[PDB]
Amino acid sequence: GYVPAVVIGTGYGAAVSALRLGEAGVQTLMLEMGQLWNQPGPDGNIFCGMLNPDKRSSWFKNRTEAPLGSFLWLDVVNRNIDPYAGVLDRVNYDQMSVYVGRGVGGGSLVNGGMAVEPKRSYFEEILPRVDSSEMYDRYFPRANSMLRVNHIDTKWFEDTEWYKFARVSREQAGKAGLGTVFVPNVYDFGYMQREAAGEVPKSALATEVIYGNNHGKQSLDKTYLAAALGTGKVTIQTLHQVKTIRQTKDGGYALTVEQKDTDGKLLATKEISCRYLFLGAGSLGSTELLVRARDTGTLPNLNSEVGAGWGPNGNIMTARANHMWNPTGAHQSSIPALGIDAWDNSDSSVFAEIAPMPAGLETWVSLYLAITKNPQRGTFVYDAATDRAKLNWTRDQNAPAVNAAKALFDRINKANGTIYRYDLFGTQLKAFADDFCYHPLGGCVLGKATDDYGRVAGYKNLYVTDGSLIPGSVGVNPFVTITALAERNVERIIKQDV
Numbered sequence: 051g052y053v054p055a056v057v058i059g060t061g062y063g064a065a066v067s068a069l070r071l072g073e074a075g076v077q078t079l080m081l082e083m084g085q086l087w088n089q090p091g092p093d094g095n096i097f098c099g100m101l102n103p104d105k106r107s108s109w110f111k112n113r114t115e116a117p118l119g120s121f122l123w124l125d126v127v128n129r130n131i132d133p134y135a136g137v138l139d140r141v142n143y144d145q146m147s148v149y150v151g152r153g154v155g156g157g158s159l160v161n162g163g164m165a166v167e168p169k170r171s172y173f174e175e176i177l178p179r180v181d182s183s184e185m186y187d188r189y190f191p192r193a194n195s196m197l198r199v200n201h202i203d204t205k206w207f208e209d210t211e212w213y214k215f216a217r218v219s220r221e222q223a224g225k226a227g228l229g230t231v232f233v234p235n236v237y238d239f240g241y242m243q244r245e246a247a248g249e250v251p252k253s254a255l256a257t258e259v260i261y262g263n264n265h266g267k268q269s270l271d272k273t274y275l276a277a278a279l280g281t282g283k284v285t286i287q288t289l290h291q292v293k294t295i296r297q298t299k300d301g302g303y304a305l306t307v308e309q310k311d312t313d314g315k316l317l318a319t320k321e322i323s324c325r326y327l328f329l330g331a332g333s334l335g336s337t338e339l340l341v342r343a344r345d346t347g348t349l350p351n352l353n354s355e356v357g358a359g360w361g362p363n364g365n366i367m368t369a370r371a372n373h374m375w376n377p378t379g380a381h382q383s384s385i386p387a388l389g390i391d392a393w394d395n396s397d398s399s400v401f402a403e404i405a406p407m408p409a410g411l412e413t414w415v416s417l418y419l420a421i422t423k424n425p426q427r428g429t430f431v432y433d434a435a436t437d438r439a440k441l442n443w444t445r446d447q448n449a450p451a452v453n454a455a456k457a458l459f460d461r462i463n464k465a466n467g468t469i470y471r472y473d474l475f476g477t478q479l480k481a482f483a484d485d486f487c488y489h490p491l492g493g494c495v496l497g498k499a500t501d502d503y504g505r506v507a508g509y510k511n512l513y514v515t516d517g518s519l520i521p522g523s524v525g526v527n528p529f530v531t532i533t534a535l536a537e538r539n540v541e542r543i544i545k546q547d548v
């Protein structure tokens with residue numbers, strides 16, 4: 051049916067948008083292709099852990115996969131599974147695999163919780179048409195509060211076995227002159243202390259994160275989406291995937307929407323129309339909808355920037371082998387707390403997560419997810435034959451990212467007399483994983499495919515809200531930026547357009 055506003059998806063951009071729309075009195079329907087994650091499963095928990103993956107781990111795959119970096123220890127727990135509407139989707143393109151959440155809350159269900167503001171000077175570099183004072187004075191603080199960002203207690207961090215892995219990399223980095231920083235998070239660190247004390251059910255301290263956290267993590271279903279539902283003006287329909295978008299002859303937008311069951315069986319195809327349409331389907335999903343609409347003629351006045359300007363936030367994974375006297379511990383919290391800040395906006399910049407590993411026995415490995423500054427960009431190109439927008443990115447386009455990550459970690463290896471691991475990513479000697487992405491950014495870039503508030507060029511009352519707006523790179527883990535930009539955008543759109 052008709053609803054005044056429709057929001058596609060339920061990740062960060064969508065959730066911010068729907069809350070503010072509901073508070074403005076606009077009746078809003080959110081359409082989410084994944085599940086509402088609230089049913090206890092066969093182990094009694096909503097989500098599977100990383101040591102007991104099952105069909106809940108995976109969006110329509112027939113075998114579970116180890117978390118990147120951990121195949122050598124976690125392949126032993128992999129199993130064949132039925133294709134199911136599980137929580138983590140590895141989306142395979144020709145030379146890049148992008149990992150995204152599927153469910154009410156999007157990537158907030160599966161991510162590491164790390165809530166980090168970009169460097170202002172870098173924000174000003176990447177988005178010069180945006181007023182940076184309103185961002186830092188108003189919208190970043192708003193996002194910080196609504197997301198429930200909190201900070202680890204330094205004494206607990208220093209003392210607990212669960213963060214030895216982080217302390218080891220801190221000491222190694224320091225020998226190279228390189229500094230670390232604490233990482234704020236939406237996982238409740240008070241709760242985490244109580245997990246370590248045996249006082250509450252474990253989640254971060256029971257090898258859970260990438261298939262969801264059964265406790266502790268304030269994903270968007272608990273924060274923005276709960277508040278949106280609380281307005282009385284927002285509803286969410288799950289297992290509903292938008293397939294096509296058109297402008298109707300009488301104005302507004304009409305959507306074709308498939309309703310499936312959790313086995314992927316098609317139950318219904320619905321037509322849903324609206325006055326205001328907000329896309330929050332992610333970098334991949336929003337871009338695909340718009341490239342499809344342009345190239346199949348349902349939104350023919352979309353511009354040539356739709357599809358362009360994608361980058362993986364410079365994501366590169368690598369690992370170092372510690373000396374035998376620097377074990378990282380069998381018990382590693384699944385939530386990172388420390389990073390190495392070597393980001394000065396130059397082409398050598400690196401912001402690298404000190405990543406836990408879930409093996410649960412001693413491996414001596416330190417793992418890192420580096421964020422780098424690499425100008426290469428890809429384009430999503432519609433394939434009418436298969437009805438899919440294909441990402442044309444080639445692995446050689448990550449060479450600048452590898453080079454930057456390697457230069458930084460070479461400094462650490464030289465100072466400490468250590469070497470890389472070469473065997474964590476596959477059998478071929480490969481120290482740098484260069485064909486994955488957790489942080490897809492771009493495809494519908496702010497001010498190029500859209501105006502400076504995400505209004506899609508060529509159309510009225512058509513908005514993009516999410517990671518597709520960002521120009522390929524933010525220099526930090528991206529959800530705080532997506533959230534704050536969405537706060538800015540929806541406030542302005544409601545004031546001027548609604």
Ligand SMILES: Cc1cc2nc3c(=O)[nH]c(=O)nc-3n(C[C@H](O)[C@H](O)[C@H](O)COP(=O)(O)OP(=O)(O)OC[C@H]3O[C@@H](n4cnc5c(N)ncnc54)[C@H](O)[C@@H]3O)c2cc1C
Nearest residue numbers: 059061062063083156157162163164292335517527528529
């Ligand atoms: C393993 C992993 C670790 C990460 N760790 C961090 C971290 O610690 N901190 C950080 O800042 N970022 C992290 N990220 C990145 C962060 O999660 C994403 O940047 C963020 O979720 C993107 O928000 P979004 O609103 O653009 O889209 P998403 O959160 O991806 O949400 C899009 C939603 O739209 C739905 N959808 C898509 N297409 C359709 C359609 N056609 N119809 C209906 N629904 C649709 C999806 O199912 C999904 O629920 C991580 C991500 C992963 C995968």
Ligand SMILES: [Mn+2]
Nearest residue numbers: 194199200201
């Ligand atoms: Mn704070």
